[PDB]
Design a protein around this nucleic acid. Sequence first.
DNA 1: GAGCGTTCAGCGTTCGTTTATCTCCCCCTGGTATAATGGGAGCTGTCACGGATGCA
DNA 2: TGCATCCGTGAGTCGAGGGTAATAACCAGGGGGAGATAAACGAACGCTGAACGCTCC
Length: 1259
Amino acid sequence: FDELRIGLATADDIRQWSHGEVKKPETINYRTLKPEKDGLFCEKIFGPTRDWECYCGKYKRVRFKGIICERCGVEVTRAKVRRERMGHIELAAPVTHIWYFKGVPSRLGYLLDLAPKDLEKVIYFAAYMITFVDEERRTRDLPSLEAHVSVERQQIEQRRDSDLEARAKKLETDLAELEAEGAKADVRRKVREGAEREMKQLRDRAQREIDRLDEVWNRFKNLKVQDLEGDELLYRELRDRFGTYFDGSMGAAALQKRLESFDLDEEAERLREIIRTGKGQKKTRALKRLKVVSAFLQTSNSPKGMVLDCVPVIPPDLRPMVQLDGGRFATSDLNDLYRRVINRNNRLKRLLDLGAPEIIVNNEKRMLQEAVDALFDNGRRGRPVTGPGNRPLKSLSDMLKGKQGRFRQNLLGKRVDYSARSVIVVGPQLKLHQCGLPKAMALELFKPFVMKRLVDLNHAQNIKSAKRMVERGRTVVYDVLEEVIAEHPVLLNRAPTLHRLGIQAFEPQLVEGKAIQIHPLVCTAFNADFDGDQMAVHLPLSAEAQAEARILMLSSNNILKPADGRPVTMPTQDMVLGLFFLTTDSEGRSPKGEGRAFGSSAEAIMAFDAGDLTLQAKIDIRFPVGTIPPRGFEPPAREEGEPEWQQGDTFTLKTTLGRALFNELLPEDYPFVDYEVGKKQLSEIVNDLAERYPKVIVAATLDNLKAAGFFWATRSGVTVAISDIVVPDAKKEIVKGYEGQDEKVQKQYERGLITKEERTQELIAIWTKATNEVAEAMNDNFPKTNPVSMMVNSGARGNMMQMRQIAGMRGLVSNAKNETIPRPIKASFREGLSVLEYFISTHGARKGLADTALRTADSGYLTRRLVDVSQDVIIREEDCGTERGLKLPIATRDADGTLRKAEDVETSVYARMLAEDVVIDGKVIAPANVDLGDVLIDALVAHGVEEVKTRSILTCESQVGTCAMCYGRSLATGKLVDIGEAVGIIAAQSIGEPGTQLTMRTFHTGGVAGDDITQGLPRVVELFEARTPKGVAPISEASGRVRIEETEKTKKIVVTPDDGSDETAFPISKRARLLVGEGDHVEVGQKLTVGATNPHDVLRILGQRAVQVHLVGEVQKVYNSQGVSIHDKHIEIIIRQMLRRVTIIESGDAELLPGELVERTKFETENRRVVQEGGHPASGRPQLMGITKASLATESWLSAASFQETTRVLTDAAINAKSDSLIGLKENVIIGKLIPAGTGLSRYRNIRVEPTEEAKAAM
DNA sequence: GAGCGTTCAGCGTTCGTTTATCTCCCCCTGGTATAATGGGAGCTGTCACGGATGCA
DNA sequence: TGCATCCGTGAGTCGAGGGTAATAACCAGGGGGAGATAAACGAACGCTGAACGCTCC
Ligand SMILES: [Mg+2]
Ligand SMILES: [Zn+2]
Ligand SMILES: [Zn+2]
């Protein structure tokens, strides 16, 4: 397995594969149910239906295999061969592949200079083509053919003379005869009028005969090849009057002749000349055409593969005529489609054999061509072959396409054995690395292991007897089962699996019932609540696989989210509420026994048990040896004339008993914490522990926090009641005052002084102010000790506006299609809405449910496309060779006489390693090649340096993937990233995981469309696809004087650049709403108006570094608007992938095509060779292209095919004949090989293990 | 030797065998002699994006 | 050269489950495999005892 070469299969190649030929539409005898002879399913060609049995019944036995029975010709072998062996159909008349024509023009290519409308006419028997002309003959014998037409021309003139003479005589005779009789007044005039009408008809006929004769002669003189000829009658006149000079034909046979006579090298030369000297769209037509035709000359394969002579047939097992229970049958649709082409081909042979006309044979050839088209791609032309009428028939390409196609349903994602499923429940008594596994569930998973142990322990005699024992479920099995599951991990998994913490290994543990017990800390990583949520269970089998589940995927080595290095295994609903009550100051209750001194922390618990002391009360408490005091307590000490070291001996401390209890959970070396804990400070110490302490201590401490948190949440006494939710007393008055304020506007609208649209905007603003005022009144009313406020202030769950609409008024509600009602909701859910208030509220509620389902769909699509472009980024080098970094602002917005750090320093500059040292006083503070952390960043801001240059993923110069140093330290582990990690897949998941969480839109459009640029997930998708924004704001090229022209038709902005350079004229919309002053200076980087900057022009003018800054900054503001935090390295990896290619312009010396994407590294190599060759280098300019476009233009056709396009990529790969080297990730999942990422690397997988000599010496 | 005692023997003597004849329905093909001479028929509304393809 | 049009592609995740319709119709001939009765050999038996030995008077 080294390369998956693909190309065009020629006619001889198809015959070579075949082990026979299908000659009938027969499938199976209706009575015996056995395959027929020389039809579909035939055993002579495909293989024997039963193992080693032939068709006639001779040679049934297994002995004489590998022979051919002389009776029926069946070769005895295994029945499985039917899945491999394939046949072929011979076609009487050639047909043309539906793929290579009838598609996009990058695959058909205009290889013959014919329009698709032209092709439709010729191959479907509606117009002729002149496949060949004897242009030399025509010149040599020209006077003879000229002599024949000239004498032929004479005859019409002689005939015209006589008919006209008779016409002249006829007019003279009838007028004269009538006038002698004189029967009426005007006999001569009426008949002469009739007579001249007859002359006109004869004269008109004379025009038809001469002009038709003229028309047939002039088509001779334009008898160039590939000339379509629409009029069938005219062709017959050409053909009958003269043969042996022009050769004409119809259909796919004509095309085959044209490709035979093609001289493709000369066509390429003339196409190159047009590219060398051409203008307008004429150059582009030659440019696209060059792409297809050049591929044919370089490749050995001939173009004749377009027109197939023999149709291969799928092996019978892949299109099964399976018996169905109940005596019915089940057949695959390929049989029906294969039946039609066999039927129509067979009839064509009959029609050709006897003498038949052209009309009848053409219709059969037309139907044969249509039948083959339906087989390869049903529905690419007209109506599909519906068969039963209820549904389109499946087709060859239909199996290779879409979400349900072979690629995306049976090669990337398969169903698996040794797997299970069940609902999940919460078990608090578990440890972090433990899960409950139901008895019955585990028994069916571990059935092979239980059977092996049952035999060894002699409870079961043999393998079949062991099988029977477990199926019955005898008592002995359960004892054996607990023995075998121990120390054997199982991989839990929830269904959406957005990010890599979706799959986590656990140590199983048997539990009765039928629901998987799970650990409450790990819920948010799975995103699992306990409404009802089935979770799949997989079992790792081999020694390598289960080793991976213990080390890599365990649930205790995954404390930190890889997105931003934030804790994920301390959720907050109950635990955080408990700890908040436990560590809070007095006055939360009656602080009994406060302001006293206690002998030891034990004695305080004694006082608490008696009830004198309370848990939340300030007290003086002593402290045993070894407990570190606060960091600010280290300089001060007790009063003594001697030096003292209070850091690890006795010390009193002003605190509360609860804080003393809480600290005992933390490890002994940890300094004391004396403040109320909340949620933010709680997350901090878990993050602090993960940095400075080993992994085992972090996992153990969380369990202590879980137990203490749950215990005190019970004792905290949070509840809900009708008297707990207290409505603001002031509220009623506040609402009435606004109503009176409102009503004057209503009054002054009745008199017509204000338009309704202006009134709606002014009322919404008035109501919005009202909601804030009643919120403030309510916030003041509530006491800090009540339940509802306590569980929001603590950060447990909920938000302020949610609490507002339970007690205070809900406020304005968004009407359908983003409008506001003028009459907001005045009642609270406690007070109970009215009927009409409830109806209007539904408009927003249902819309939110429908929209949320859509955002999941789009976020899933965004993640999938991101993964393709972001793969092939693997850490494959310890350290890069280079010095180029990126300059980031550590500190900004510094008020006068003080230094203020940057607001987003964590996501931006943390966990990066300095490209070069930093000197401010002439001395290095932070040396180079040191990753930045809390301590180092503090050093730099204290000394006052305002920027830093950190090495980063963009400027990495690694020939394969990215080095470890440029990526900097990872975030899920807090150490330098390991070699072989797949940073690419990690980055894609991190961007896509909070996509569902975004859900942001303009609150109200205001009645204007286009003023507000795309927000949220559409904006993210727009940024990553390189799409020009909906609201586009132009960019200044350089300095100069700018001014505005307010033309009536449309607005306009014209800027006169300084230094005499060429004028530049910018257009704008009529509602431009610009902001720059008139006749004033402009700079290079500013944007002229409000909107969203176009990423392409920022690349064009500013530079590659600037567009990197722009893209990372733009997408981050979407995320930071909500509250999610993604470290900039994750963004940077994807943006690195977009800038990789380069667009070549003026491709004279590089010798490849102009104006197509080419990767940067190949461009550099080709230029280096050409200057070595003496030729001047070809230029290139950087080009940014979307994640979709970047993914498709990859070297590996197999990975590209497994992406969105599965026809175009297959079609052009066949033309280009691209051998797929199998290096990569997606394509190594298709074949079943080991992915080059992590343990699959050459370096990690090839190691060897031997003991030491001292180990052998002992035993 | 008497009288009967075991056991090859080759030889008949038809019965053993498999192997040769010979009589029968599904299955395929061909043929009807007034005159008869261009389909029914099922649709249709997502959404954005882009690039080919037509045409003023 | 620009503007107008249509065509192709993609659009989440795991759960639950099995059947679809309609019009000249016949002798007439005749082939071709699928099931029904006498001839070639050798093996059970068959009396043929005959031809050998095994004990007994
Ligand atoms: Mg749920
Ligand atoms: Zn056979
Ligand atoms: Zn590097």
